Amino acid sequence: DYTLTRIDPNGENDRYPLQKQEIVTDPLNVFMGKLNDMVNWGRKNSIWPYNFGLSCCYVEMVTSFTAVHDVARFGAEVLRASPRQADLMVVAGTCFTKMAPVIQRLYDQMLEPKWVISMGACANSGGMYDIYSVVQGVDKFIPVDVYIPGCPPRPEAYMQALMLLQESIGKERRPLSWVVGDQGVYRANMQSERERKRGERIAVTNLRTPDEI
Amino acid sequence: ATIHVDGKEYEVNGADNLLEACLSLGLDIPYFCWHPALGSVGACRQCAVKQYQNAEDTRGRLVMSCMTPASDGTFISIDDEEAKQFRESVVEWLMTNHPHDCPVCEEGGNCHLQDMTVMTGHSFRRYRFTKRTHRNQDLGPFISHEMNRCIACYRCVRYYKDYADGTDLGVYGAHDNVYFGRPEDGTLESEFSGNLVEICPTGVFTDKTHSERYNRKWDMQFAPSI
Amino acid sequence: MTLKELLVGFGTQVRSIWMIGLHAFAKRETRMYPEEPVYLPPRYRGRIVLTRDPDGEERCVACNLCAVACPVGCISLQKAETKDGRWYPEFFRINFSRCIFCGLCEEACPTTAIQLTPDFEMGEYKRQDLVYEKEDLLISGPGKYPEYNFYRMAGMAIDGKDKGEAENEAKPIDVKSLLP
Amino acid sequence: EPAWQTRDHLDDPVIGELRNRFGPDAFTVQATRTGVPVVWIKREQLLEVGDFLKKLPKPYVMLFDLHGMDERLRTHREGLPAADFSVFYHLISIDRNRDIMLKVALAENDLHVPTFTKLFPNANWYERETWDLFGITFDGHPNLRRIMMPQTWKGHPLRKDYPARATEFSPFELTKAKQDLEMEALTFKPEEWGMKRGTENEDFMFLNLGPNHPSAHGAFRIVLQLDGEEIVDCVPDIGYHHRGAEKMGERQSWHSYIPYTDRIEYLGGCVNEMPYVLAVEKLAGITVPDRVNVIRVMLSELFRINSHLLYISTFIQDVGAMTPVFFAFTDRQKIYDLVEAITGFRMHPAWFRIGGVAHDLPRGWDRLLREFLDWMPKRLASYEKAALQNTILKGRSQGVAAYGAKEALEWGTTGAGLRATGIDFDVRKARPYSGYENFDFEIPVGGGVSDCYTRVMLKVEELRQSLRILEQCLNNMPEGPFKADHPLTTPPPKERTLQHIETLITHFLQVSWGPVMPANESFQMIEATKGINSYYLTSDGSTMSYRTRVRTPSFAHLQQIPAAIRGSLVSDLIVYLGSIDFVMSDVDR
Ligand SMILES: CCCCCCCCCCC1=C(C)C(=O)C(OC)=C(OC)C1=O
Ligand code: SF4
Ligand code: SF4
Ligand code: SF4
Ligand code: SF4
Ligand code: SF4
Ligand code: FES
């Protein structure tokens, strides 16, 4: 229940992303597993987002940074202006066709490990902008770890996606060093949130009427 | 022939009625009972326009454009206030008994009655009493029958009996209980019964074969074919 | 700069430091998601559901008005019919990776079947899972509108509601009736 | 006579002046619902007419808008000159409080117009966009290159034969060759803009200030030619936020386009919805009731306070003080409490309708409005004392990127910059709309210099005035309908839709095929959060817009940037970008 990705920027593959993915089994012993868990804990509790925004979704993400939401509580407020110091790229906005090589370049300039959250309907699929100048989803060329529906997602939806990314990071397998060992990145194939929440969602019967505050 | 419509001069065929002449010019007059292939009968009273004998006439008189020849020198107004109010009143009278059926009606989005309700500008209901209802008939595998939606425009019987020479469709009953259908349940025997689904301006006669896998007209991908 | 400008600037710097240091004694403004739940007002436009009438049947008559009213085109459904003749969606899928939560489908719904509900937590790992079929949309109650039944108003006959049994409907009169 | 009635505006004195100067056969007056005299002039007389309007006794000083239109599919062109394409020029006389729209007809083969850049220097970017999207050449333009699309783009997307949807073309496939090609095309070429690489003593550093820069307000690049830290020249590179919103206007029904209007200026919300619904209501012949006017004004002022809070806090953050943005976003959350309760959404409510608003006000809205009106003023006074009266902020902003009334007028600058130059021009007072004349509020004006500091403090005073308007909205809220009684009110009131058949029919057709707007041209200008925002709508008689032209103020302000910042330090440009009040959705549409 793991997908292994191996990157190959100079291989015989031109289409982005320059990577290959294969469904494998969990590679994980009594000490390497514990130290991998410690590295995953440290990485998931210190996620520095890239100060990068395309449209209105960025306004909601930085709203989550402020005092009324305080995403600092999760340890994810540091907000680096440099791609080298950033761990998380939030595609917060429309992937405009003119902006797509820029997004690819900025993703290339980030360093390992890196995660991608596609925030909002535009970044997810193109959203309402099925139009000549808009790429229909940033996952046409960027591998995406978490998708947030919404236009915009509210700041707590961005926080919920941050927690989802934390659970995905906490059970991933990455090279502990670049000198010795397997260097491919193993990501757990999680149960979908739709299937997880289906039981409590279908059981809803009555909601408040839209007539009061 | 030269006619005047709302102060605009037009060249028309004098052998045509005013409704077909004005529709050929691109003007919008609401209509139900007239059809180009069936002729005019003046039943639905929807196509009212105000007529003036001279240019220096301001009183006028409401006439049926489908029943009025488009002769030389006629003055008419479509956008007259009394004409617009009467056409809206005709739509409202048709709406008094019409069922609340558009979401579950196969004619929706393709319905001439919907279009003429919108075209006259009638959107407020003030009738508060009961709506008459009808049972339906089984008309065979091709045509589905829903008489609640009938506006009694007589198009079906005029097409089926006068045009197509069919014998098993007719109009029964009287005043506001007029029923359009067969004398009993059974398959419509005309080889051209299927044209009723386009002839009927409402969802009384609908395509049952399409109704099995129904979609609306806007969702359809069309092509010209043979 | 002048001496007065220097003294005034020193005073303004001192004032700024003092006011932020007094903010250190203030009540916190943070709404602590997720430990305290987000309050959403009742008409908040979040996750879309399909609802049921008070009799327990699904309200959706598969009229396709929501799909055409959607400016994104992220609703796809197909009409089907039961034996008694009621219309219902054979399938109903919503692409939530596309949906902008504008609420135009709920506004266009003539049966109050489709409703936007106060729920914003729909983040996913794979965006193919953001395609919600009818099994993930149809809830077990009326949702925001507790009493409306479209079929109680429609003239079309279904099971348990014959001709003449809808609201504001008279009983059908046969053309063979003896009364004039 | 209702305000939406078709008028030719022959009683406007500018028509008589043009008739006396050029003759009665030199131009054709078109009757519209734009509220503005629309005059078709010959292409050979365009510069003469523009010069004559520039030198009138009470002159037309601002080129408000300049764009094109593809008339080849327009079936209702009665009384109009024969045109395959056309270019329109919206000019404003502030001292007359009047405006005129000149129109030039063009044949398909001869798609060239004389450039307007000598008369109005802000015509440069408008002509670049008209060339980019329509393929209309402007002769004598100093640099007529693409501005919305990349340089390696084929075709002109606003043409009627260009496909709108991305799914018409192949899905986006980023390859190595394509990435190298578009990254080469994005690379700045200083020889194409008349810049040298340096002097003999030193080299100029060409710096990308964006698209990914903390001070660029979105997808936006300025290429700075730097001598040390001095800006020798700059080229603002826009079009990175181009969403095809006008093309989408030709692609959605009149009702289903409203959420797109929300995302034109994404900090504006209902403010962005207001000119579109007013222009559609002019097309539909709808006069909304008083309660609708007050509801729309209240939502507009709430979103104006929201946008101004973000603007003031981000200016303070750009100057260097990072604390007030936390508190200001808390204030934005108080506004969002009210806005979520009323509309069901935070950022893009999509809540205005043709003929009214989507729902009535929920029970208990006045409690939330009263809470915000009690919360706001102490917070604003705290921001003023802690940050805006700090002398380091004043030394960063006072006297920085300054321009006067002449520079504001020649670049189309509106909003706080224009009123900071001393010109008292606000749309809500000069051309009142939506019942704004029933509210008492002041329009703050500057002393004559449009500073960074003056623009920010003018927006602070505008925030206080919007608080006054909201107090009046809370205290005097009319009882009545939230939707007009017109047949074209889209959608109709929902309860009548759910129980009345004719209302159900109207709703059915309005949400599916769309409301039918009779063929006309309409225009609505409003005071948006960042300046003057306008919608120019052409109906061809269908359920879709034939042409949706959105004039946004941020386009003009970003074009003004190199004239006002040339010869300054980079820090001055950072403060200038913070004080313009722009978002790039507004710039690129
Ligand atoms: C970091 C602590 C919380 C403050 C949040 C940042 C302040 C608001 C962001 C302003 C902004 C906007 C709107 C913006 O659109 C933009 O472009 C993406 C920026 O540059 C990175 C911005 O800085
Ligand atoms: S998804 Fe909506 S809110 Fe987010 S960038 Fe797109 S238009 Fe803006
Ligand atoms: S016949 Fe027309 S108006 Fe009547 S229910 Fe069907 S679609 Fe509606
Ligand atoms: S069944 Fe149809 S065609 Fe016949 S009278 Fe009724 S509405 Fe007209
Ligand atoms: S909320 Fe808007 S975008 Fe989402 S399914 Fe409904 S109509 Fe479509
Ligand atoms: S508009 Fe309502 S009843 Fe019609 S198909 Fe959509 S959810 Fe079903
Ligand atoms: S169409 Fe003329 S009366 Fe029916």
PDB file of C-alpha atoms and ligand atoms in Angstrom, chain C residues 48 66 69-75 94-96 98-106 114 116, ligand 5:
ATOM      1  CA  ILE C  48     -23.053  19.643  -1.419  1.00  0.00           C
ATOM      2  CA  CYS C  66     -28.695  22.184 -11.448  1.00  0.00           C
ATOM      3  CA  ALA C  69     -27.205  26.193 -14.040  1.00  0.00           C
ATOM      4  CA  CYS C  70     -23.701  25.225 -12.921  1.00  0.00           C
ATOM      5  CA  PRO C  71     -21.248  27.718 -14.476  1.00  0.00           C
ATOM      6  CA  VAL C  72     -18.437  25.191 -14.038  1.00  0.00           C
ATOM      7  CA  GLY C  73     -20.339  22.270 -15.559  1.00  0.00           C
ATOM      8  CA  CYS C  74     -19.305  19.963 -12.719  1.00  0.00           C
ATOM      9  CA  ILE C  75     -22.642  18.142 -12.268  1.00  0.00           C
ATOM     10  CA  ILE C  94     -20.273  16.110  -8.792  1.00  0.00           C
ATOM     11  CA  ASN C  95     -16.659  17.003  -9.576  1.00  0.00           C
ATOM     12  CA  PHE C  96     -15.669  18.729  -6.345  1.00  0.00           C
ATOM     13  CA  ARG C  98     -13.962  21.706 -10.105  1.00  0.00           C
ATOM     14  CA  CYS C  99     -16.803  22.993  -7.925  1.00  0.00           C
ATOM     15  CA  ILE C 100     -16.537  26.598  -6.769  1.00  0.00           C
ATOM     16  CA  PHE C 101     -19.255  26.311  -4.068  1.00  0.00           C
ATOM     17  CA  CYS C 102     -21.196  29.172  -5.620  1.00  0.00           C
ATOM     18  CA  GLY C 103     -24.562  27.689  -4.659  1.00  0.00           C
ATOM     19  CA  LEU C 104     -26.162  28.277  -8.060  1.00  0.00           C
ATOM     20  CA  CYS C 105     -27.272  24.635  -8.290  1.00  0.00           C
ATOM     21  CA  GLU C 106     -29.145  24.821  -4.969  1.00  0.00           C
ATOM     22  CA  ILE C 114     -29.437  19.638  -3.836  1.00  0.00           C
ATOM     23  CA  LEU C 116     -24.917  23.357   0.093  1.00  0.00           C
TER      24      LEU C 116
HETATM   25  S1  SF4 E   5     -21.961  25.180  -6.075  1.00  0.00           S
HETATM   26 FE1  SF4 E   5     -21.722  26.184  -8.126  1.00  0.00          FE
HETATM   27  S2  SF4 E   5     -19.849  25.211  -9.040  1.00  0.00           S
HETATM   28 FE2  SF4 E   5     -20.551  23.849  -7.321  1.00  0.00          FE
HETATM   29  S3  SF4 E   5     -21.881  22.262  -8.329  1.00  0.00           S
HETATM   30 FE3  SF4 E   5     -23.227  23.964  -7.556  1.00  0.00          FE
HETATM   31  S4  SF4 E   5     -23.481  25.367  -9.350  1.00  0.00           S
HETATM   32 FE4  SF4 E   5     -21.669  24.029  -9.792  1.00  0.00          FE
END
